[PDB]
Amino acid sequence: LPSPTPNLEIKYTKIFINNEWQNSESGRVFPVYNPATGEQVCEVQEADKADIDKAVQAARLAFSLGSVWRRMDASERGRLLDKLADLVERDRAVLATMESLNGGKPFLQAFYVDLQGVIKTFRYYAGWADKIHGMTIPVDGDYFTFTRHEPIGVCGQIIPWNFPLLMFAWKIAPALCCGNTVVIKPAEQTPLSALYMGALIKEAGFPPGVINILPGYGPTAGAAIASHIGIDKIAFTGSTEVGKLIQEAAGRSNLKRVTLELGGKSPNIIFADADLDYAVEQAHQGVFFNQGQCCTAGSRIFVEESIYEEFVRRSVERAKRRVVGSPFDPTTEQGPQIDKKQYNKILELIQSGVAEGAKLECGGKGLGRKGFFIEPTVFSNVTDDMRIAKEEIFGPVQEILRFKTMDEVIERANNSDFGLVAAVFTNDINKALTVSSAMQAGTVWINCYNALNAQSPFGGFKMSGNGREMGEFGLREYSEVKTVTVKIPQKNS
Amino acid sequence: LPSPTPNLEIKYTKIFINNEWQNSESGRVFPVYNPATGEQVCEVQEADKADIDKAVQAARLAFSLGSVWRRMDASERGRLLDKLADLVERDRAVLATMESLNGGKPFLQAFYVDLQGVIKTFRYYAGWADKIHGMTIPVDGDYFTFTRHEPIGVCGQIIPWNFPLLMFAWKIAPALCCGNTVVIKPAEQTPLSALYMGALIKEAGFPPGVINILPGYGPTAGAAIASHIGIDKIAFTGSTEVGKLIQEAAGRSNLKRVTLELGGKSPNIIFADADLDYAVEQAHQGVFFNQGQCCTAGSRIFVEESIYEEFVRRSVERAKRRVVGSPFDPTTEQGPQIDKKQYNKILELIQSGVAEGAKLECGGKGLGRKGFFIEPTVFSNVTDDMRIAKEEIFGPVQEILRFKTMDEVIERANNSDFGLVAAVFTNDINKALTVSSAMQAGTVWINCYNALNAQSPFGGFKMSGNGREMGEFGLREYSEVKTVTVKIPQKNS
Numbered sequence: 001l002p003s004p005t006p007n008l009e010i011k012y013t014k015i016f017i018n019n020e021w022q023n024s025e026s027g028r029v030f031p032v033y034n035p036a037t038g039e040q041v042c043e044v045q046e047a048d049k050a051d052i053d054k055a056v057q058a059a060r061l062a063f064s065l066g067s068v069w070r071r072m073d074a075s076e077r078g079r080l081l082d083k084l085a086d087l088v089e090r091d092r093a094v095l096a097t098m099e100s101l102n103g104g105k106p107f108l109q110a111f112y113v114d115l116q117g118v119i120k121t122f123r124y125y126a127g128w129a130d131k132i133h134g135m136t137i138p139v140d141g142d143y144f145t146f147t148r149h150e151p152i153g154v155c156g157q158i159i160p161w162n163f164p165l166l167m168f169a170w171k172i173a174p175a176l177c178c179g180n181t182v183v184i185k186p187a188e189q190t191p192l193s194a195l196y197m198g199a200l201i202k203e204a205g206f207p208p209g210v211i212n213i214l215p216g217y218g219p220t221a222g223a224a225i226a227s228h229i230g231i232d233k234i235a236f237t238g239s240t241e242v243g244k245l246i247q248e249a250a251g252r253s254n255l256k257r258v259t260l261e262l263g264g265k266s267p268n269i270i271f272a273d274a275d276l277d278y279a280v281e282q283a284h285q286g287v288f289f290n291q292g293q294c295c296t297a298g299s300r301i302f303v304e305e306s307i308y309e310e311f312v313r314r315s316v317e318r319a320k321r322r323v324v325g326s327p328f329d330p331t332t333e334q335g336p337q338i339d340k341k342q343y344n345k346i347l348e349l350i351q352s353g354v355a356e357g358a359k360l361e362c363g364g365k366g367l368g369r370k371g372f373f374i375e376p377t378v379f380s381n382v383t384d385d386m387r388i389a390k391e392e393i394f395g396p397v398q399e400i401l402r403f404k405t406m407d408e409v410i411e412r413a414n415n416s417d418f419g420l421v422a423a424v425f426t427n428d429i430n431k432a433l434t435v436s437s438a439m440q441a442g443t444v445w446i447n448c449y450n451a452l453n454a455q456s457p458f459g460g461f462k463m464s465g466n467g468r469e470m471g472e473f474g475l476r477e478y479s480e481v482k483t484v485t486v487k488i489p490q491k492n493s
Numbered sequence: 494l495p496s497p498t499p500n501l502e503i504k505y506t507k508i509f510i511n512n513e514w515q516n517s518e519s520g521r522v523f524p525v526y527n528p529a530t531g532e533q534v535c536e537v538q539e540a541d542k543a544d545i546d547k548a549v550q551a552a553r554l555a556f557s558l559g560s561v562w563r564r565m566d567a568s569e570r571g572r573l574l575d576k577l578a579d580l581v582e583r584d585r586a587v588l589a590t591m592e593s594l595n596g597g598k599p600f601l602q603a604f605y606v607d608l609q610g611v612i613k614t615f616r617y618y619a620g621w622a623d624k625i626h627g628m629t630i631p632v633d634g635d636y637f638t639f640t641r642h643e644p645i646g647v648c649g650q651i652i653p654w655n656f657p658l659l660m661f662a663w664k665i666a667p668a669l670c671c672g673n674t675v676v677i678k679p680a681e682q683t684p685l686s687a688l689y690m691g692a693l694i695k696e697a698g699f700p701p702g703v704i705n706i707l708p709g710y711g712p713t714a715g716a717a718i719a720s721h722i723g724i725d726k727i728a729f730t731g732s733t734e735v736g737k738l739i740q741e742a743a744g745r746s747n748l749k750r751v752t753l754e755l756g757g758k759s760p761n762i763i764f765a766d767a768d769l770d771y772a773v774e775q776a777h778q779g780v781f782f783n784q785g786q787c788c789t790a791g792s793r794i795f796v797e798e799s800i801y802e803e804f805v806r807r808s809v810e811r812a813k814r815r816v817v818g819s820p821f822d823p824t825t826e827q828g829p830q831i832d833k834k835q836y837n838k839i840l841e842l843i844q845s846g847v848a849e850g851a852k853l854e855c856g857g858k859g860l861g862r863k864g865f866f867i868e869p870t871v872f873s874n875v876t877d878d879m880r881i882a883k884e885e886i887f888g889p890v891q892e893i894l895r896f897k898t899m900d901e902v903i904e905r906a907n908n909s910d911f912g913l914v915a916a917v918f919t920n921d922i923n924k925a926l927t928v929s930s931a932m933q934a935g936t937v938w939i940n941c942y943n944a945l946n947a948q949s950p951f952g953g954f955k956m957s958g959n960g961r962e963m964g965e966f967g968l969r970e971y972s973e974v975k976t977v978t979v980k981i982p983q984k985n986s
């Protein structure tokens with residue numbers, strides 16, 4: 001198996017604008033921490049509005065008609081994405097080490113999940129660049145009508161700390177595929193892998209200004225992007241709460257186009273005719289993967305009454321043996337939460353569960369004295385009115401509910417402001433299709449959980465988001481459609 | 494030729510919810526006027542928040558799983574749209590008369606343009622309902638993945654007074670095609686044809702609550718729709734200013750999906766090789782059609798300087814002969830503006846043009862008769878810094894500018910926060926394609942103007958809107974995409 005890079009240097013700590021490494025305009029640098037120890041790893045140049053402004057100017061010039069990026073064959077945009085994939089593959093262990101050190105992700109999981117996703121995302125979209133087609137249309141009257149799908153322009157992108165590098169790839173790959181330029185802001189907690197990608201972008205040979213990477217905080221760098229009158233499109237992944245602010249800012253400023261990938265409280269429905277041991281393991285991973293810090297978390301597990309007691313027992317056994325420890329250690333299943341703020345929020349919600357009469361089966365406490373580790377926690381006898389049944393915990397807390405009928409569980413699963421994902425476990429084709437069709441969710445899994453692929457679109461119903469990422473449909477957010485209608489002397493079919 | 498329905502009575506004046514005619518909850522009514530005479534036509538029930546709430550509940554129930562509308566074959570949704578087209582065709586003269594009386598549109602133009610568009614829109618979308626396809630996707634891993642394209646749910650729609658019935662059709666046709674339910678709010682100036690459509694919707698046999706029609710004011714009924722937490726999607730056509738408020742309100746409330754069709758200051762570029770008889774007439778219609786009350790108005794005509802003087806001469810001649818009068822008179826080319834507020838806005842902008850040194854070639858005043866009639870007005874020697882060159886007038890005011898080079902006119906055409914449409918008149922293939930490709934506009938015409946078709950998408954770049962209506966792409970705003978990923982024991986290609 002691969003090992004964490006020894007003596008990892010953090011070489012790239014500056015703002016990346018126009019393929020040049022720059023100090024912040026203010027001169028400030030901000031600290032970056034290791035969530036396993038609480039100790040400072042390094043300092044990073046702290047971008048604010050002045051820096052955003054320079055980045056937008058660079059991105060706008062790079063998007064100008066006649067520029068290298070605009071004149072480039074679509075196929076050559078694709079080649080650049082493929083080159084970037086090659087470089088990520090070359091530096092896979094370094095990047096996984098960085099994600100582990102900075103993000104708290106177990107190194108092997110960062111290597112085999114996150115980095116695999118990054119590489120596959122770039123390789124997938126590399127293939128789309130010269131296959132984005134408009135249409136020719138048999139309109140009424142003596143006209144020739146066609147559509148031209150063009151890049152929108154300068155795209156602002158704001159990404160979270162739970163999947164720093166993977167979300168970076170999810171954002172820039174479709175944007176670049178379509179020929180846009182980018183100003184991207186990684187989360188304050190987790191800038192490092194994004195900055196390393198700046199070095200790879202330069203090495204790959206992207207024209208200056210096509211990707212600009214602006215590390216810094218939300219009210220400064222993030223807000224400056226959201227309200228910028230020179231940015232045509234914003235893509236945001238994060239909390240539903242902040243998503244509302246993004247949409248508001250878009251409306252108030254320049255009506256920039258918006259897509260949002262937001263939170264969830266996703267249902268996972270287990271029928272008695274499911275493969276039980278498989279369902280237990282899948283539901284366990286479905287909530288505990290990535291320290292519970294997944295918008296996809298299956299945080300409402302509905303179990304059919306006849307298998308409820310056994311499902312709970314097996315789930316508790318599994319949670320009790322789940323190995324929490326140092327991200328670099330190959331035995332580790334679960335690393336720390338990202339920071340103290342998240343740690344405290346999780347503990348408060350656990351206490352709410354106890355207070356409101358959910359059965360605490362195991363866990364419920366922090367682990368150790370350093371970093372932000374929390375015991376794998378299981379609640380049973382959860383009911384729909386409980387805070388823990390409604391609020392996104394974003395930590396290692398499993399909630400198990402009971403149901404009797406398919407009609408009941410469909411209603412209860414759908415009774416949410418959220419609708420990111422859902423799942424159903426059953427060997428009955430009729431139940432599987434009925435439930436999956438009825439779910440108000442952007443992705444529904446049948447007899448699996450957390451099965452994501454570069455080829456398949458992903459996004460929220462309701463307040464879990466607007467628009468889709470990944471697959472062909474991810475590209476729809478990153479082009480502007482132009483209809484051209486030409487008068488012709490006479491039309492024939 | 495057809496004649497306006499004699500002694501037209503307004504049968505339908507009430508709120509339409511759940512296929513029933515209802516009084517306002519408050520009991521309040523509001524007056525509706527004839528813009529040609531200033532006289533009151535009738536009173537209509539005034540919808541407010543309480544009425545919106547009732548309509549949303551009806552629309553939600555009609556959208557419930559297992560409802561008649563949800564269970565219906567897609568092909569049968571299509572048949573209902575085709576039936577509605579049949580009924581509009583049957584009542585074409587009545588509806589055109591109503592659009593003329595209420596909206597100030599010359600009767601023959603309402604009959605042959607607006608009503609034609611209504612019928613064609615319904616017949617076009619009738620054909621789409623059972624041809625909306627998801628995909629099956631060759632994802633990595635042992636999975637079967639497909640997408641379901643589902644209706645979003647309850648769609649709030651707000652439409653303007655400049656094309657009351659046509660915009661009603663533009664909105665409900667794609668929404669219903671996709672299987673949504675609708676709460677639609679016509680402009681307070683022009684509710685009448687929308688209410689008549691309620692009668693036809695019931696007659697066609699749409700299930701109760703599928704379309705609900707809520708006449709009332711913007712700050713009351715309109716705002717209630719925009720902020721409603723039980724509405725999944727909003728579509729708004731109107732000013733950019735109000736568009737910004739819609740997006741903001743969506744962000745603040747429930748992150749409902751937003752599409753906007755907003756203002757323009759669209760360029761119409763005439764090269765010296767253009768046929769003048771044709772180009773002058775097309776440019777004339779391009780700005781004067783529908784009392785100048787078109788988002789598509791070609792309100793910046795750029796003429797190559799060698800033909801500029803002649804183009805102006807011809808344009809002035811045409812404007813001076815343009816017949817302004819009673820909408821019911823078959824000789825009338827131009828009816829009144831919609832109301833006194835718009836009338837005053839137009840005159841103020843004309844005054845600004847004179848003050849800033851534009852050359853008033855003809856017109857420039859109200860006609861001084863009953864109603865809200867304004868002389869066809871032509872300005873030449875318009876420059877880019879003038880208020881009339883920047884601000885949407887929405888009245889019978891033509892603006893003619895000169896240019897010398899292609900590079901120049903592309904830059905000047907695109908130097909705008911708007912980008913709804915554009916046109917270029919030239920027989921030179923290279924110039925035509927270079928200019929059309931370079932325009933930052935959602936529709937570009939070559940050697941024509943105002944050529945719209947049910948088959949071709951339409952919408953704004955920049956602050957002229959977000960999203961597209963009409964054609965296949967119009968449907969994309971009215972479906973939610975669900976990915977379903979099924980674990981399978983083994984995959985083969």
Ligand SMILES: CCc1cnccc1C(=O)Nc1cc(C)c2c(c1)CCC(=O)N2
Pocket residue numbers: 112113114116117118120121163166289293294295296297450452453454
């Ligand atoms: C590119 C697909 C892929 C391929 N190979 C490896 C990984 C991926 C990939 O993206 N996986 C992935 C896994 C999970 C659990 C989540 C997300 C992504 C998005 C955020 C979230 O909440 N959950």
Ligand SMILES: CCc1cnccc1C(=O)Nc1cc(C)c2c(c1)CCC(=O)N2
Pocket residue numbers: 605606607609610611613614656659782786787788789790943945946947
């Ligand atoms: C359905 C296409 C169609 C077909 N036959 C007849 C009419 C139509 C149709 O819609 N025409 C149309 C004409 C103009 C000038 C405008 C608009 C629509 C949209 C608003 C605007 O500003 N301008």
